[PDB]
Amino acid sequence: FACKTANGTAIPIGGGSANVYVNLAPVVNVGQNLVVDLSTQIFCHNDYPETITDYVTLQRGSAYGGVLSNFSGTVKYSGSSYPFPTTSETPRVVYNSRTDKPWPVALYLTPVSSAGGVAIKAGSLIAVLILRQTNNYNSDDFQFVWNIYANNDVVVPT
Numbered sequence: 659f660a661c662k663t664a665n666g667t668a669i670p671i672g673g674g675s676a677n678v679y680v681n682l683a684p685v686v687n688v689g690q691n692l693v694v695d696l697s698t699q700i701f702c703h704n705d706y707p708e709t710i711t712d713y714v715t716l717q718r719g720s721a722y723g724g725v726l727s728n729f730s731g732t733v734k735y736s737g738s739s740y741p742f743p744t745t746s747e748t749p750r751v752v753y754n755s756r757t758d759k760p761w762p763v764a765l766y767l768t769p770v771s772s773a774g775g776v777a778i779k780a781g782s783l784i785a786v787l788i789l790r791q792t793n794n795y796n797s798d799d800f801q802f803v804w805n806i807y808a809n810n811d812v813v814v815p816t
């Protein structure tokens with residue numbers, strides 16, 4: 659089991675960490691969602707599906723910077739909604755293919771009433787998403803830590 663981003667940034671067998679740089683909608687109103695789709699950004703595969711099934715969760719999703727300050731959120735994992743920042747580990751997604759498949763995570767971030775003006779700064783960390791991989795075969799238990807950064811400012815009109 660290993661993962662790589664659309665940017666080609668790899669985290670090998672055994673886990674690790676990687677930075678992910680995303681383009682965000684430039685303008686988002688209070689009450690509406692900024693959508694951060696990681697399913698086009700992060701991909702993983704199973705190296706031995708003949709014998710092993712990999713189990714993959716979002717163990718923890720944390721908000722940072724302008725997202726923590728200016729937004730409330732949910733995360734969709736495999737299309738189902740949970741609080742973001744997370745308050746528990748998600749259900750597991752089974753990874754049974756040697757072909758890469760997306761990690762099915764998207765954030766839906768709504769500016770709160772206090773927000774206005776520049777709500778997320780270009781270059782800033784918006785989220786850390788911890789992918790946890792275990793399996794049905796041995797004791798492997800590894801974290802693939804994804805730091806998510808904004809490529810551009812996000813403005814909340816006033």
Ligand SMILES: COc1ccc(C#CCO[C@H]2O[C@H](CO)[C@@H](O)[C@H](O)[C@@H]2O)cc1
Nearest residue numbers: 659671672703704705706710712793798
């Ligand atoms: C008994 O003979 C064996 C021969 C090969 C293997 C193996 C293997 C590959 O392991 C990797 O790939 C597995 C499948 O993706 C993961 O579950 C592991 O955590 C790890 O990343 C295990 C047992």
